[PDB]
Amino acid sequence: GDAYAQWLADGGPSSGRPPPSG
């Protein structure tokens, strides 16, 4: 899913959330 694009924008792992799968 497009959630990964936002996940990286939030600093990736730094954000404090699991990387979306699809």
mmCIF file of C-alpha atoms in Angstrom:
data_model
loop_
_atom_site.group_PDB
_atom_site.id
_atom_site.type_symbol
_atom_site.label_atom_id
_atom_site.label_comp_id
_atom_site.label_asym_id
_atom_site.label_seq_id
_atom_site.Cartn_x
_atom_site.Cartn_y
_atom_site.Cartn_z
ATOM 1 C CA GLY A 1 0.000 0.000 0.000
ATOM 2 C CA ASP A 2 0.885 3.702 -0.221
ATOM 3 C CA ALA A 3 1.265 3.742 3.599
ATOM 4 C CA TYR A 4 4.975 2.910 3.169
ATOM 5 C CA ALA A 5 5.529 6.218 1.342
ATOM 6 C CA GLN A 6 4.212 8.072 4.409
ATOM 7 C CA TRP A 7 6.071 5.750 6.805
ATOM 8 C CA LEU A 8 9.421 6.760 5.274
ATOM 9 C CA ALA A 9 8.357 10.430 5.261
ATOM 10 C CA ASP A 10 7.927 10.173 9.054
ATOM 11 C CA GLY A 11 11.623 9.277 9.413
ATOM 12 C CA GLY A 12 11.182 5.559 8.721
ATOM 13 C CA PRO A 13 12.006 3.422 11.830
ATOM 14 C CA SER A 14 12.454 6.692 13.779
ATOM 15 C CA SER A 15 8.685 7.298 13.500
ATOM 16 C CA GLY A 16 8.122 4.477 15.997
ATOM 17 C CA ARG A 17 5.766 2.330 13.896
ATOM 18 C CA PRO A 18 5.977 -0.954 11.902
ATOM 19 C CA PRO A 19 6.657 -0.664 8.122
ATOM 20 C CA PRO A 20 3.359 -1.201 6.201
ATOM 21 C CA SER A 21 3.090 -4.367 4.095
ATOM 22 C CA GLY A 22 1.488 -3.401 0.779
#
